[PDB]
Amino acid sequence: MAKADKATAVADIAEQFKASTATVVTEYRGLTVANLAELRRALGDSATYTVAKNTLVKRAASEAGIEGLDELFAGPTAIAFVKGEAVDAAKAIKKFAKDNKALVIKGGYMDGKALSVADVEKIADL
Amino acid sequence: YRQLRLERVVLVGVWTEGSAADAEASLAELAALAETAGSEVLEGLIQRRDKPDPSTYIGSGKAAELREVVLATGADTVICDGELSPAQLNALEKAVKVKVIDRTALILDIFAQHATSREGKAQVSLAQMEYMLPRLRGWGESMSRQAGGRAGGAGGGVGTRGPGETKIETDRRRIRERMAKLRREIRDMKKIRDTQRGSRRRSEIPSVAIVGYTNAGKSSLLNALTGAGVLVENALFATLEPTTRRGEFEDGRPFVLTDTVGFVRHLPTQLVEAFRSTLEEVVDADLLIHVVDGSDVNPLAQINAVRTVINEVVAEYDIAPPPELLVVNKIDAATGVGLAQLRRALPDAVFVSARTGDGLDKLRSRMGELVESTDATVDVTIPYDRGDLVARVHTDGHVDATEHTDAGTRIKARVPAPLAATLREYATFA
Amino acid sequence: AKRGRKKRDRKHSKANHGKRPNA
Amino acid sequence: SRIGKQPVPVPSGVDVTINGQNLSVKGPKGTLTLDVAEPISVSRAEDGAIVVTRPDDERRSRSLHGLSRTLIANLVTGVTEGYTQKMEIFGVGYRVQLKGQNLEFALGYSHPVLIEAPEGITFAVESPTKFSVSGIDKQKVGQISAVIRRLRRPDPYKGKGVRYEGEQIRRKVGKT
Amino acid sequence: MLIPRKVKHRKQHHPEQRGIASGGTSVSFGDYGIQALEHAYITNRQIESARIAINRHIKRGGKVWINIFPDRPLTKKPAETRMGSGKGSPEWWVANVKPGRVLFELSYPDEKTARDALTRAIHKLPIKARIVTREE
Amino acid sequence: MKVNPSVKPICDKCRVIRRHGRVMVICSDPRHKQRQG
Amino acid sequence: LIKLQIQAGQANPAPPVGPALGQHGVNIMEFCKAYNAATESQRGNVIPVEITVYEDRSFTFALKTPPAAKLLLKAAGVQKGSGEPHKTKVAKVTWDQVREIAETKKADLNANDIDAAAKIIAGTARSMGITVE
Amino acid sequence: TANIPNKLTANVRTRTGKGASRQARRDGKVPAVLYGHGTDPQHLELNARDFAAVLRSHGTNAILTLDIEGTEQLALTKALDVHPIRRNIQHADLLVVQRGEKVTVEVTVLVEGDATPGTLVTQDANTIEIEAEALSIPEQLTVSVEGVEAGTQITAGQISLPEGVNLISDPELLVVNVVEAPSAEALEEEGA
RNA sequence: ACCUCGAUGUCGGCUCGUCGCAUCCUGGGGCUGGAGCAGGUCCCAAGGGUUGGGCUGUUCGCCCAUUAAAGCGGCACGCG
RNA sequence: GCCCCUAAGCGUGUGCUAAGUGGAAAAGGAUGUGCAGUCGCGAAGACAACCAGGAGGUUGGCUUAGAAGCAGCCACCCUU
Numbered sequence A: 001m002a003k004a005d006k007a008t009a010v011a012d013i014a015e016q017f018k019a020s021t022a023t024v025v026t027e028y029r030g031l032t033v034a035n036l037a038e039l040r041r042a043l044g045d046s047a048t049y050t051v052a053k054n055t056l057v058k059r060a061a062s063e064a065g066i067e068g069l070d071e072l073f074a075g076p077t078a079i080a081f082v083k084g085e086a087v088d089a090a091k092a093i094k095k096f097a098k099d100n101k102a103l104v105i106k107g108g109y110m111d112g113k114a115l116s117v118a119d120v121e122k123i124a125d126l
Numbered sequence B: 001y002r003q004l005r006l007e008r009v010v011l012v013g014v015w016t017e018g019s020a021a022d023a024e025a026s027l028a029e030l031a032a033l034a035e036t037a038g039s040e041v042l043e044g045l046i047q048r049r050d051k052p053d054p055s056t057y058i059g060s061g062k063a064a065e066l067r068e069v070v071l072a073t074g075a076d077t078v079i080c081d082g083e084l085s086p087a088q089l090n091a092l093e094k095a096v097k098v099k100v101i102d103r104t105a106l107i108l109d110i111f112a113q114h115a116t117s118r119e120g121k122a123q124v125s126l127a128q129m130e131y132m133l134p135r136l137r138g139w140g141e142s143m144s145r146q147a148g149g150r151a152g153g154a155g156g157g158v159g160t161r162g163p164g165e166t167k168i169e170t171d172r173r174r175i176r177e178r179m180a181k182l183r184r185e186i187r188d189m190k191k192i193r194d195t196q197r198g199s200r201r202r203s204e205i206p207s208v209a210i211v212g213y214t215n216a217g218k219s220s221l222l223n224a225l226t227g228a229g230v231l232v233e234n235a236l237f238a239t240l241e242p243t244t245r246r247g248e249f250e251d252g253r254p255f256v257l258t259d260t261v262g263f264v265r266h267l268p269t270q271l272v273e274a275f276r277s278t279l280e281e282v283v284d285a286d287l288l289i290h291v292v293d294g295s296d297v298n299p300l301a302q303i304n305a306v307r308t309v310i311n312e313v314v315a316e317y318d319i320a321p322p323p324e325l326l327v328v329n330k331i332d333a334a335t336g337v338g339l340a341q342l343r344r345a346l347p348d349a350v351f352v353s354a355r356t357g358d359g360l361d362k363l364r365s366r367m368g369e370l371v372e373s374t375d376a377t378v379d380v381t382i383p384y385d386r387g388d389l390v391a392r393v394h395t396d397g398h399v400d401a402t403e404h405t406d407a408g409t410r411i412k413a414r415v416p417a418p419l420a421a422t423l424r425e426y427a428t429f430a
Numbered sequence C: 001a002k003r004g005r006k007k008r009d010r011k012h013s014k015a016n017h018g019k020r021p022n023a
Numbered sequence D: 001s002r003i004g005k006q007p008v009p010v011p012s013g014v015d016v017t018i019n020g021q022n023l024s025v026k027g028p029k030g031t032l033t034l035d036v037a038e039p040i041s042v043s044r045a046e047d048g049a050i051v052v053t054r055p056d057d058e059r060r061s062r063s064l065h066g067l068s069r070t071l072i073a074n075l076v077t078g079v080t081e082g083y084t085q086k087m088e089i090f091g092v093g094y095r096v097q098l099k100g101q102n103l104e105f106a107l108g109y110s111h112p113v114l115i116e117a118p119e120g121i122t123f124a125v126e127s128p129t130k131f132s133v134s135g136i137d138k139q140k141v142g143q144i145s146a147v148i149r150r151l152r153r154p155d156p157y158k159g160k161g162v163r164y165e166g167e168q169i170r171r172k173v174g175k176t
Numbered sequence E: 001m002l003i004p005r006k007v008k009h010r011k012q013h014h015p016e017q018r019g020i021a022s023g024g025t026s027v028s029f030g031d032y033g034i035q036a037l038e039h040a041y042i043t044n045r046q047i048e049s050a051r052i053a054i055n056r057h058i059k060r061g062g063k064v065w066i067n068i069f070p071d072r073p074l075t076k077k078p079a080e081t082r083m084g085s086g087k088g089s090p091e092w093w094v095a096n097v098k099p100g101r102v103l104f105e106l107s108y109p110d111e112k113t114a115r116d117a118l119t120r121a122i123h124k125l126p127i128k129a130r131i132v133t134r135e136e
Numbered sequence F: 001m002k003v004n005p006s007v008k009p010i011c012d013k014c015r016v017i018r019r020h021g022r023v024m025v026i027c028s029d030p031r032h033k034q035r036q037g
Numbered sequence G: 001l002i003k004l005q006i007q008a009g010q011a012n013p014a015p016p017v018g019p020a021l022g023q024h025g026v027n028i029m030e031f032c033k034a035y036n037a038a039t040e041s042q043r044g045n046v047i048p049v050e051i052t053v054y055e056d057r058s059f060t061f062a063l064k065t066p067p068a069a070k071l072l073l074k075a076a077g078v079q080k081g082s083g084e085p086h087k088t089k090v091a092k093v094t095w096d097q098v099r100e101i102a103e104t105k106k107a108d109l110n111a112n113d114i115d116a117a118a119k120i121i122a123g124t125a126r127s128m129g130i131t132v133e
Numbered sequence H: 001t002a003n004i005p006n007k008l009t010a011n012v013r014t015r016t017g018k019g020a021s022r023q024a025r026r027d028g029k030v031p032a033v034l035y036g037h038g039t040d041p042q043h044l045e046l047n048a049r050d051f052a053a054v055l056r057s058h059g060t061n062a063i064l065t066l067d068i069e070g071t072e073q074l075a076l077t078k079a080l081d082v083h084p085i086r087r088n089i090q091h092a093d094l095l096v097v098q099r100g101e102k103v104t105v106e107v108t109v110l111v112e113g114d115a116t117p118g119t120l121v122t123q124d125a126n127t128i129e130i131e132a133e134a135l136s137i138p139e140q141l142t143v144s145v146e147g148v149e150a151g152t153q154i155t156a157g158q159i160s161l162p163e164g165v166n167l168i169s170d171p172e173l174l175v176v177n178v179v180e181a182p183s184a185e186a187l188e189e190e191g192a
Numbered sequence I: 001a002c003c004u005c006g007a008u009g010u011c012g013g014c015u016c017g018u019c020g021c022a023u024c025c026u027g028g029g030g031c032u033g034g035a036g037c038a039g040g041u042c043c044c045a046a047g048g049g050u051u052g053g054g055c056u057g058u059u060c061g062c063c064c065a066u067u068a069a070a071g072c073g074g075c076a077c078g079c080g
Numbered sequence J: 001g002c003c004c005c006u007a008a009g010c011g012u013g014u015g016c017u018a019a020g021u022g023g024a025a026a027a028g029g030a031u032g033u034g035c036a037g038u039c040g041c042g043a044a045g046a047c048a049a050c051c052a053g054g055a056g057g058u059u060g061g062c063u064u065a066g067a068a069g070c071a072g073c074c075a076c077c078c079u080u
């Protein structure tokens, strides 16, 4: 609960948000901190997971085309950035989610605009 | 009002029996007490007589000589090596024209000076006024202060009704009122502490009491063995409140070192009644450590003093004499033959330098072995699942040989009877 | 004691103005 | 005010009647009644809820708002699910035996002790060393549970007695 | 224990009380100080007790000043006598304190421990006091 | 239980309240519970 | 329920194991031999083990990497920690060694950052009082 | 360094005396007097609230600008008569000071830092005198006590003054003394 | 030194009381360094009870044998 | 002084008190309550509430039969 750190957190989020070719936002309510270790070990080839505070994520969401996910900023934020494209990381993100059941994918962003969960999961399974 | 003030001292003493060595030692310790009280010793006179002087404790010519001595030296107090009647006090006062104090009054004022808190103030006040009543006429003629006055007694024409005369107000009337109330509290605190002393006795925890001479390192032994610091030693030329703390033996078995006020030759019985508060500790004590200064050339005097006081106390409750461990402290101060002159008469005493602990190991061994443990020698083997029982053996038990085997932990130890009954099943001699 | 205390306190009143005879 | 403002939902299998100042609530378990403080108003929302409001924001009104709200909440919860408070007994030789509408404890006393279940409450027994008390009113359930608790004075030294399942009572020691 | 080493007159009128302190009303020797809000006669015994309280609370350092000194003599007649025959002898020594006058000064790094010591002292004292410090 | 005109929360757990017009203290340790009177 | 440390070289140590976990009802006889057969290649290096027991005392042993204190101190050669941590120098260690110990410990750590684990081990060392750089 | 003169209002006091002044203090106006080389002084009523606010913000030697009857007047408060029981500001002395006028002012001396573990600090003089132009008066000065060893004496002449500032006071005056910490026995000896 | 000196008759014991609770016993609780027994402390409680002898003029005080207990004070140190 | 005793007002307006305070009292204790003024955090989600996160480095080292996070002592660093 800090105020001056709002801008720092927003900048740190935005830099990696733009660096990642595509991003997907989920809620990770249920997994012990350890399971994130296996998740990152599995996704290390193409993607990286990170937690964030929705209170500042909503404010930072107006910078780019993630505004379409305004309704989707609920629950414990978990960003799974993908280095390049979305399938390369989604193919493993979806399988890890279906295995552990501690993650629910709610939003995504690619090409400067938001894509739906149906789009993300179709790219994953394709 | 009614206090005491050895301004400057001019000791007077009478040698009645014993030896010149005894007389000089008595007068010198009296001078030491006076110096502690604060008076400065100017000179010390001694008169040798077959028996005391029941007139004024000295000859009349000697009294005139002392008057001249006091006028010449500009002294203010004369301290006499004895306890004297009010008549003798008044005679000496009219012969010398100065305040005359004695050994008993000096010691009582020393106690008043030292006592800080607790029941000590009440004890000191009661002892002082009980000693002042027999000398109420002697001190009452050596009033001092008083703001003078005239009689101070004139009611009025009586008629058909005598004066109230229900005077429940008097010199000691309060002292009497007070002590009558405060004896109950004196006993009540004893009893409430005894409520836990009994539980201490329940365990092996034995009571060890220090019996020592005044200003005889009585607190050095505590600070050496127990280690705990004692405020102002709680033991010196004159302490009142005894202390105690939980230490450990040579073997490790716990116990309580009880530091107690020291003794002086013929300590006034008015103060032996206050000493009772620490001298029931001698009967409570499983062991007695009889400490004596090592630099002394006549230890037997103080040894006999402590022995007679403890005999007087024990005779009351006919308790079997506890073990006595003779200890000589501050040993380095004397020569080899100086130690021998005591050793030859009393060879079992252990000479320990409390300032550094020389021989303290042997002292601890001796006292621990003298305080026989109230345990049971038991050999047992307990499976590994009884690690809690092994832990309890470590905590309360006395391990002698602990080893391990597939069956369990072979422990030979000294343990309390309850635990011995508890784990009797696995005993080798089951 | 009560007698004296009340005797004095009668002094603080609306018709006496803080002064009464005999204290 | 805070808590007192939150409206009270009324589950489907419930019945409410806000008659004058009094409130009556019925359901599968049974009927219950309550009254309200004059400076607090009560009403029926159009969406199956009970609304409680105040005409002011004073000390008494603020204190009473949450009170009345939770009173209604407990009323509606009782008329549907009621309450059941567990118990348990520790100590070798201690026992409890059901006598229908009444209950017996053997607690090491000279004479076994009888407690009679009052109207609107039932005693269920799962074993000689544990049981439960059920009813439709939280106040009565708790009162009877406490009365059962009072039977044997606390025994810190050994802990034997009747206590709730979750209670972790103090435990000192005696020398021997 | 404080006692004037000499006094020109040993039997003086009673120090008058009315008025507010016109001097010694500002802490000057240390960080915190104790100010008085009503009149009193602080005696050497109470001053010594309060000083011991502060020193025994701090236990390892700091510095304490006593901006007041008991020097006025006060005399009581001998016990159980009548009115007459001159004034009594001087028995206890007091300082005529007035509202505002600062009594004790303390300098210690730890503000809360200093405040605690000052509270102990004001309890031992017979007067309503308050802790103050240098700042306005 | 103690009944003194001065009541102190002598430990972190102690809680002061005013009950029926009389201040008092409660604690997880009954040694500390006390009333003002 | 219980987690201790044991060296694969030997088994059934009296103080460390005797009254430590055998008190809780563990089949030490079989557990020690199973652990030795599982990790005898490590020789006498101490290794942490955590035991998980079921209702019927059926046991499973989980292994972790050798202690960070040992890994930090053996390099210098000292086989014990600092009696007064941070007050007495006991050894000198390099930042590369600290990071390598951190990477080895990441399995023991609940961490997912290798540099952060390096920070972990740097603290673990300097708190004992070991020079790190 | 420089400071903006703080704007205050001030109405000429109609009548004077103890009664008038205490009624003004009662209803919230602190009485004050503005004097200086500018001919016969005048008597003003200042709002106690904002006056105390500016005083606490900018020290006891802040620079004021009185809107007396609208007429702007730069001034410098010289001293404050403050009650010793309730710390109520009963009077203020204001000195008409023209731009760049050199004035003698009293400035506090703060202490910052800590000495060796077995040591104690003892400040001795809050106020030191200074000469400086009206608008360059520091609110406070500072004296370093970091890493000082054993007995140390800091005098008015051993401090670092600002530029445009001269030390009126005697340079040898002792303002801080750092001395070995007292023991418990030394504490008891004190006052014996 | 305010009423009473053209009079208010005094200590202890006896008979007869009556009131206060700052409770000795009996009753109800809290805490206890409250295993049990037996204690200690504090809170509430004034309904009833509260021995007979030796020494002492004695108030008071010490002692003997009991007792659940052998409470403390006011009422012209209650009452000639 | 003005409700009835008891002549005159259960007078008018604005607030405070729950103690019959009013209609006696001290040090000192305290979270009763009205007002005024401050300073910290606060929809960027303040405090509370429910916790899926709060696990592990690792006996942090010495003491340790033993202190594995909370018999003790030293630092007391650290992500996710």
Ligand SMILES: Nc1nc2c(ncn2[C@@H]2O[C@H](COP(=O)(O)OP(=O)(O)NP(=O)(O)O)[C@@H](O)[C@H]2O)c(=O)[nH]1
Pocket (backbone or CB within 6 Å): B036, B215, B216, B217, B220, B232, B233, B235, B236, B237, B295, B330, B333, B355
């Ligand atoms: N002879 C001797 N005495 C020692 C030794 N160690 C301690 N003491 C005694 O310890 C005392 C310490 O002072 P303390 O007991 O507190 O009281 P005090 O010194 O007697 N006070 P006062 O001077 O008034 O008599 C010394 O006086 C000395 O009597 C020692 O080695 N030898």
